[PDB]
Amino acid sequence: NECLGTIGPVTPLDASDFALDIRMPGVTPKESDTYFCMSMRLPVDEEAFVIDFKPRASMDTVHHMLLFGCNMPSSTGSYWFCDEGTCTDKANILYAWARNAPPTRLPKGVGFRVGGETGSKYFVLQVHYGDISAFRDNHKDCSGVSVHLTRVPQPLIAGMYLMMSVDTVIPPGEKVVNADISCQYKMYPMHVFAYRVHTHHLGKVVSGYRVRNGQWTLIGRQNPQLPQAFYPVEHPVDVTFGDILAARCVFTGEGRTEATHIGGTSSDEMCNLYIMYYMEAKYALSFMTCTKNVAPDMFRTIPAEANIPIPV
């Protein structure tokens, strides 16, 4: 009893707010550990602000959910299979829901800008099912997310600073392989309030830092084998013009017969750190990406914790 039926996906909230429900179209996964995607055009063409997210997940069957904004979803039609292949243009992550790692709300006054001339025209929802119990009866699943949108401009604008490896090669059996990422920050100040890490099975630890005058300030560090939620930052951290952002993923090659490189499958790897930030509305940009390592030598003074795993 979650599929919306005759009422549809759009609930008016007041004069300038509405909830948009983004739901799987009554799907039934045949195999276990399945990744479904679907998209929705924004109903409004003009600029809007996403100011809250409420999960609508079947607590039996849903392992994780991700919601992106983009302009070109990978597929048209109802739903598709997406082993993390959501958009053809760049997919902007907005929200992660993981089982056993409950999400944290956006700070009040903070929203993502979407729609209009430059914002995302589509949402893409990815749902990872995992365990196919309770699907015995072959019931239709309508899991996803209810998104609160408003036309009211927000004083603070949420954005994403994505750090990702592109060139990493993990030789087979190799005990430790480091993937290092670094860029100089050249925008108005951002304040990091949440982070998410992502590797595949070879990832041991992922850490990100702001480097200012050789001083390393921790943004977040996580075991990527733990649920890949957005975790709150322990202390709010500003990144300002002249700062360097730095991240290290630690991988092992133990267990593999052949080299492992970066790519989109499970026998490939990724080193992704998603740094969620707010900015003053008049200075804000919605996304930044670092795919480089501009200060490789700086990593000589990376804190020792970046090399040590988290005790599970």
Binding site for Cu ion (CB under 5 A): 63-64, 84, 128, 270
Q: Which is nearer to Ni ion, 60 or 280 (CB)?
A: 280
270 binds, among Ni ion, Cu ion, none (CB under 5 to 8 A by kind): Cu ion
> Could you tell me the smallest distance in angstroms from the CB atom of residue 189 to Ni ion?
7
The active-site residue out of 200, 228, 279, 288 is: 200
- Has 154 been annotated as catalytic? no
210 binds, among Ni ion, Cu ion, none (CB under 5 to 8 A by kind): none
The active-site residue out of 40, 64, 65, 222 is: 64
- Has 63 been annotated as catalytic? yes
- Has 126 been annotated as catalytic? yes
Q: Which is nearer to Ni ion, 97 or 193 (CB)?
A: 193
* Cβ–Cβ under 8 Å, residues 79 and 38: yes
Q: Which is nearer to Cu ion, 51 or 82 (CB)?
A: 82
Long-range contacts of 206-209 (CB under 8 A, 24+ apart): 206/247, 206/248, 206/249, 206/250, 206/271, 206/273, 207/247, 207/248, 207/303, 207/305, 207/306, 208/163, 208/245, 208/246, 208/247, 208/273, 208/275, 209/245, 209/246, 209/247, 209/302, 209/303, 209/306
The site that binds Ni ion (CB under 5 A) totals a number of residues, namely 1
- Has 222 been annotated as catalytic? no
Burial class (CB in 10 A: 0-12, 13-18, 19+), 171: exposed
On whether 235 is known to bind a ligand per the annotation, the reply is no
Strands 215-222, 169-170: pairing is: unpaired
196 binds, among Cu ion, Ni ion, none (CB under 5 to 8 A by kind): none
On whether 164 is known to bind a ligand per the annotation, the reply is no
Q: Which is nearer to Ni ion, 83 or 238 (CB)?
A: 238
> How far apart, in Å, are the Cα atoms of 292 and each of 117, 234, 296?
29, 26, 10
Binding map of Ni ion across residues 234-263, x = CB under 5 A, - = no contact: ----x-------------------------
238 binds, among Ni ion, Cu ion, none (CB under 5 to 8 A by kind): Ni ion
Q: Is the dihedral of CA 68, 104, 286, 117 positive or negative?
A: positive
Under the binding rule (CB under 5 A), the answer on residue 280 touching Ni ion is no
User: What is the torsion angle, in degrees rounded to the nearest 10, for the CA atoms of residue 305, residue 261, residue 82 and residue 86?
Assistant: 70
Q: Would you say how long the chain is, in residues?
A: 312
Annotated binding residues, as ranges?
Answer: 63-64, 128, 198, 200, 270
Active site residues: 63-64, 126, 128, 198, 200, 270
